[PDB]
Amino acid sequence: DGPMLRLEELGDQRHAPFRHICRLCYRVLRHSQQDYRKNQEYIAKQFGFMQKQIGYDVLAEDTITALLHNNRKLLEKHITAAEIDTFVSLVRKNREPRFLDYLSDLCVSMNKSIPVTQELICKAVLNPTNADILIETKLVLSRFEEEVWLFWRDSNKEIRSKSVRELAQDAKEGQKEDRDVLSYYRYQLNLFARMCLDRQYLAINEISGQLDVDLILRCMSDENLPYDLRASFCRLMLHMHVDRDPQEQVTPVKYARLWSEIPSEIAIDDYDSSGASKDEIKERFAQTMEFVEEYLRDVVCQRFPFSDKEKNKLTFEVVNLARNLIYFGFYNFSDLLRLTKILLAILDCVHV
């Protein structure tokens, strides 16, 4: 401990079992601060002191995230812009993806979002990223076999060229660099699924300039990618594309109609002819509507429709996407029954 002690080879640490014993300290420290306000305020006084130890792989980041997760009054004031900038800077030198989830979980609490927390993070994510952080998006189509390419820049001032499917295939081969690339890619998709919540336009407009419905759906028609990636693509697609102006929740039952407008005969063929304006909107997700249908075809034939855990993880966000689409008035009454029979087929196969 001359200047300090480093967990790396610079200074002796005697890691592995000793760290296993040490992590109990912060584990029981988190146990103490569960659902107890006074402990939170008592630990809050060390807010400045606890800043430095973050990033030393000593579970200090876990402790600070646990403390900041369940105290909104503490979070709204103690967390500052410089702290977020330091968080961002730590990852670049760390060259590790797992740090990314902690920043994302800051803005989400009690299944809602804090506006000031999202505002202080949107610019702090978009501005430092572009220098060299990795970006890991570079959404350009092969036309712009159609494919998208994941060109990421490392710290060695070098441009890596690789198709998404090829690097995904190499990830299961045993390549650690591509595994970390996919980890950071899924993490940044998860981030991108958070700043766009509950109609805040400090980041939605910027994101929509690169992402498109067909661009994201290109990640829906390929099964080569691991299903966690597609899980991220579905949720970000829902959060940014679906919830935006001008589309809004529709009323199911109408209490006031016009006599002359209603024809003498009403049938399914003319169920909802009052959606002429939204015809383009339906068109730009009509293919998405189709994939929602045949995705259920892909799973009906299974003897156990919930066999694989990764397939289970794939299922939930697609369920959510359709769940939101149906209330957004996207499906005509003819399509509701078509979805209903395939939906009930899964429940029938559940008994097997």
XYZ file of N, CA, C and O in Angstrom, residues 164-245:
328
model
N -22.299 -9.595 -38.900
C -22.897 -9.914 -37.606
C -23.009 -11.422 -37.416
O -22.658 -11.958 -36.356
N -23.483 -12.133 -38.442
C -23.661 -13.574 -38.314
C -22.323 -14.289 -38.180
O -22.211 -15.269 -37.439
N -21.295 -13.815 -38.889
C -19.995 -14.474 -38.817
C -19.384 -14.347 -37.427
O -18.871 -15.327 -36.872
N -19.431 -13.147 -36.843
C -18.899 -12.964 -35.497
C -19.745 -13.707 -34.471
O -19.223 -14.226 -33.477
N -21.058 -13.788 -34.703
C -21.896 -14.614 -33.841
C -21.512 -16.087 -33.909
O -21.486 -16.755 -32.871
N -21.224 -16.602 -35.106
C -20.771 -17.983 -35.239
C -19.427 -18.190 -34.553
O -19.198 -19.230 -33.926
N -18.520 -17.218 -34.673
C -17.235 -17.322 -33.991
C -17.372 -17.244 -32.477
O -16.536 -17.807 -31.763
N -18.400 -16.555 -31.974
C -18.580 -16.446 -30.530
C -18.818 -17.808 -29.892
O -18.261 -18.109 -28.830
N -19.649 -18.645 -30.517
C -19.862 -19.990 -30.002
C -18.690 -20.913 -30.298
O -18.594 -21.986 -29.692
N -17.802 -20.523 -31.215
C -16.611 -21.321 -31.479
C -15.646 -21.296 -30.303
O -14.934 -22.278 -30.066
N -15.607 -20.192 -29.559
C -14.708 -20.073 -28.430
C -13.858 -18.821 -28.474
O -12.830 -18.737 -27.795
N -14.273 -17.839 -29.272
C -13.556 -16.574 -29.359
C -14.021 -15.645 -28.243
O -15.215 -15.351 -28.128
N -13.075 -15.185 -27.423
C -13.418 -14.322 -26.300
C -13.703 -12.892 -26.747
O -14.570 -12.224 -26.173
N -12.977 -12.401 -27.755
C -13.182 -11.028 -28.209
C -14.579 -10.843 -28.788
O -15.263 -9.861 -28.484
N -15.028 -11.789 -29.616
C -16.378 -11.700 -30.164
C -17.435 -11.914 -29.090
O -18.516 -11.317 -29.156
N -17.146 -12.757 -28.095
C -18.069 -12.911 -26.977
C -18.240 -11.597 -26.228
O -19.362 -11.208 -25.887
N -17.136 -10.891 -25.975
C -17.219 -9.587 -25.325
C -17.907 -8.560 -26.214
O -18.631 -7.691 -25.711
N -17.691 -8.640 -27.527
C -18.373 -7.741 -28.455
C -19.880 -7.939 -28.368
O -20.645 -6.973 -28.281
N -20.329 -9.197 -28.374
C -21.758 -9.469 -28.246
C -22.287 -9.063 -26.876
O -23.420 -8.582 -26.765
N -21.492 -9.260 -25.821
C -21.918 -8.841 -24.489
C -22.156 -7.339 -24.438
O -23.214 -6.882 -23.987
N -21.191 -6.555 -24.920
C -21.341 -5.107 -24.928
C -22.448 -4.662 -25.877
O -23.138 -3.678 -25.597
N -22.644 -5.381 -26.987
C -23.716 -5.059 -27.924
C -25.087 -5.256 -27.292
O -25.948 -4.370 -27.370
N -25.308 -6.407 -26.655
C -26.566 -6.634 -25.955
C -26.755 -5.622 -24.834
O -27.865 -5.119 -24.625
N -25.680 -5.301 -24.108
C -25.789 -4.334 -23.022
C -26.183 -2.958 -23.541
O -27.025 -2.278 -22.945
N -25.589 -2.524 -24.653
C -25.921 -1.197 -25.157
C -27.309 -1.175 -25.782
O -27.986 -0.143 -25.747
N -27.765 -2.302 -26.335
C -29.166 -2.392 -26.734
C -30.083 -2.257 -25.524
O -31.103 -1.556 -25.577
N -29.727 -2.914 -24.419
C -30.511 -2.789 -23.195
C -30.551 -1.345 -22.718
O -31.607 -0.847 -22.312
N -29.407 -0.659 -22.762
C -29.388 0.770 -22.459
C -30.342 1.529 -23.370
O -31.203 2.281 -22.900
N -30.232 1.307 -24.680
C -31.070 1.985 -25.659
C -32.548 1.686 -25.470
O -33.385 2.428 -25.992
N -32.885 0.624 -24.749
C -34.267 0.332 -24.408
C -34.760 1.101 -23.189
O -35.912 0.918 -22.786
N -33.926 1.951 -22.589
C -34.275 2.635 -21.348
C -34.423 4.141 -21.481
O -35.372 4.702 -20.935
N -33.520 4.824 -22.191
C -33.627 6.276 -22.286
C -34.832 6.728 -23.101
O -35.165 7.917 -23.078
N -35.489 5.819 -23.819
C -36.606 6.160 -24.687
C -37.961 5.959 -24.021
O -38.995 6.139 -24.672
N -37.980 5.612 -22.738
C -39.219 5.278 -22.057
C -40.083 6.522 -21.842
O -39.622 7.659 -21.964
N -41.369 6.268 -21.587
C -42.392 7.246 -21.176
C -42.235 8.612 -21.849
O -42.344 9.666 -21.220
N -42.012 8.576 -23.163
C -42.120 9.750 -24.031
C -41.250 10.913 -23.544
O -41.741 11.982 -23.179
N -39.942 10.685 -23.541
C -38.963 11.755 -23.402
C -38.211 11.878 -24.721
O -37.758 10.875 -25.280
N -38.111 13.101 -25.238
C -37.635 13.312 -26.598
C -36.215 13.864 -26.650
O -35.805 14.407 -27.681
N -35.459 13.740 -25.561
C -34.057 14.133 -25.594
C -33.179 13.093 -26.275
O -32.064 13.422 -26.690
N -33.654 11.853 -26.402
C -32.895 10.795 -27.051
C -33.680 10.016 -28.094
O -33.061 9.344 -28.925
N -35.013 10.085 -28.077
C -35.815 9.319 -29.028
C -35.555 9.794 -30.452
O -35.349 8.989 -31.368
N -35.549 11.113 -30.656
C -35.333 11.652 -31.994
C -33.944 11.302 -32.515
O -33.779 10.983 -33.698
N -32.931 11.364 -31.649
C -31.577 11.011 -32.067
C -31.471 9.536 -32.432
O -30.847 9.184 -33.439
N -32.071 8.660 -31.624
C -32.001 7.228 -31.898
C -32.722 6.889 -33.196
O -32.211 6.125 -34.023
N -33.910 7.461 -33.407
C -34.697 7.142 -34.593
C -34.024 7.581 -35.888
O -34.448 7.140 -36.962
N -33.004 8.439 -35.818
C -32.282 8.828 -37.015
C -31.422 7.728 -37.597
O -31.086 7.781 -38.785
N -31.059 6.735 -36.790
C -30.282 5.585 -37.236
C -31.093 4.303 -37.290
O -30.932 3.514 -38.222
N -31.972 4.081 -36.318
C -32.781 2.875 -36.282
C -34.035 3.036 -37.139
O -34.618 4.118 -37.240
N -34.450 1.931 -37.754
C -35.660 1.896 -38.563
C -36.425 0.620 -38.249
O -35.898 -0.306 -37.628
N -37.687 0.585 -38.684
C -38.511 -0.605 -38.480
C -37.927 -1.792 -39.236
O -37.751 -2.882 -38.679
N -37.611 -1.594 -40.518
C -37.013 -2.672 -41.296
C -35.605 -2.987 -40.815
O -35.188 -4.150 -40.848
N -34.865 -1.974 -40.357
C -33.510 -2.209 -39.870
C -33.510 -3.125 -38.653
O -32.695 -4.051 -38.563
N -34.417 -2.884 -37.705
C -34.509 -3.757 -36.539
C -35.103 -5.108 -36.921
O -34.654 -6.156 -36.439
N -36.118 -5.111 -37.790
C -36.731 -6.366 -38.208
C -35.754 -7.264 -38.954
O -35.934 -8.486 -38.960
N -34.722 -6.690 -39.576
C -33.680 -7.516 -40.175
C -33.036 -8.422 -39.138
O -32.524 -9.494 -39.477
N -33.059 -8.012 -37.871
C -32.608 -8.848 -36.769
C -33.685 -9.806 -36.281
O -33.418 -10.603 -35.374
N -34.886 -9.748 -36.857
C -35.986 -10.631 -36.488
C -36.138 -11.829 -37.412
O -36.641 -12.870 -36.980
N -35.718 -11.708 -38.668
C -35.883 -12.766 -39.655
C -34.714 -13.740 -39.691
O -34.729 -14.671 -40.504
N -33.702 -13.551 -38.848
C -32.556 -14.448 -38.785
C -32.516 -15.123 -37.423
O -32.569 -14.451 -36.388
N -32.433 -16.452 -37.428
C -32.308 -17.235 -36.209
C -30.863 -17.571 -35.875
O -30.609 -18.219 -34.855
N -29.913 -17.144 -36.709
C -28.510 -17.468 -36.471
C -28.014 -16.841 -35.177
O -27.257 -17.464 -34.425
N -28.434 -15.609 -34.902
C -27.982 -14.905 -33.717
C -28.503 -15.597 -32.459
O -29.568 -16.222 -32.480
N -27.763 -15.520 -31.354
C -28.292 -16.024 -30.084
C -29.550 -15.265 -29.696
O -29.689 -14.071 -29.969
N -30.478 -15.976 -29.054
C -31.800 -15.407 -28.822
C -31.787 -14.250 -27.830
O -32.759 -13.490 -27.785
N -30.729 -14.093 -27.032
C -30.658 -12.934 -26.145
C -30.479 -11.646 -26.940
O -31.041 -10.599 -26.586
N -29.701 -11.705 -28.024
C -29.574 -10.549 -28.903
C -30.933 -10.137 -29.450
O -31.351 -8.982 -29.305
N -31.654 -11.085 -30.052
C -32.987 -10.795 -30.557
C -33.926 -10.350 -29.447
O -34.831 -9.549 -29.700
N -33.721 -10.840 -28.223
C -34.496 -10.350 -27.090
C -34.275 -8.860 -26.889
O -35.229 -8.101 -26.683
N -33.017 -8.426 -26.951
C -32.735 -6.999 -26.855
C -33.351 -6.226 -28.016
O -33.910 -5.138 -27.813
N -33.252 -6.766 -29.235
C -33.803 -6.064 -30.393
C -35.315 -5.898 -30.292
O -35.842 -4.847 -30.672
N -36.026 -6.917 -29.805
C -37.475 -6.795 -29.664
C -37.853 -5.718 -28.655
O -38.744 -4.901 -28.920
N -37.196 -5.698 -27.489
C -37.589 -4.747 -26.452
C -37.244 -3.317 -26.848
O -38.044 -2.400 -26.621
N -36.067 -3.099 -27.443
C -35.749 -1.746 -27.889
C -36.686 -1.300 -29.003
O -37.107 -0.134 -29.032
N -37.028 -2.215 -29.916
C -37.980 -1.897 -30.973
C -39.316 -1.477 -30.386
O -39.866 -0.438 -30.760
N -39.836 -2.261 -29.441
C -41.071 -1.883 -28.768
C -40.959 -0.494 -28.159
O -41.744 0.403 -28.493
N -39.928 -0.276 -27.335
C -39.852 0.946 -26.543
C -39.730 2.185 -27.418
O -40.336 3.219 -27.116
N -38.958 2.116 -28.499
C -38.759 3.317 -29.301
C -39.773 3.457 -30.428
O -40.341 4.540 -30.603
N -40.014 2.400 -31.212
C -40.952 2.499 -32.324
C -42.393 2.606 -31.841
O -43.151 3.456 -32.324
N -42.796 1.750 -30.901
C -44.216 1.612 -30.590
C -44.727 2.824 -29.822
O -45.717 3.452 -30.212
N -44.056 3.178 -28.729
C -44.513 4.265 -27.866
C -43.885 5.562 -28.360
O -42.736 5.874 -28.038
N -44.644 6.318 -29.143
C -44.183 7.581 -29.702
C -45.400 8.322 -30.240
O -46.493 7.760 -30.352
N -45.210 9.576 -30.559
C -46.295 10.289 -31.211
C -46.412 9.849 -32.669
O -45.421 9.434 -33.279
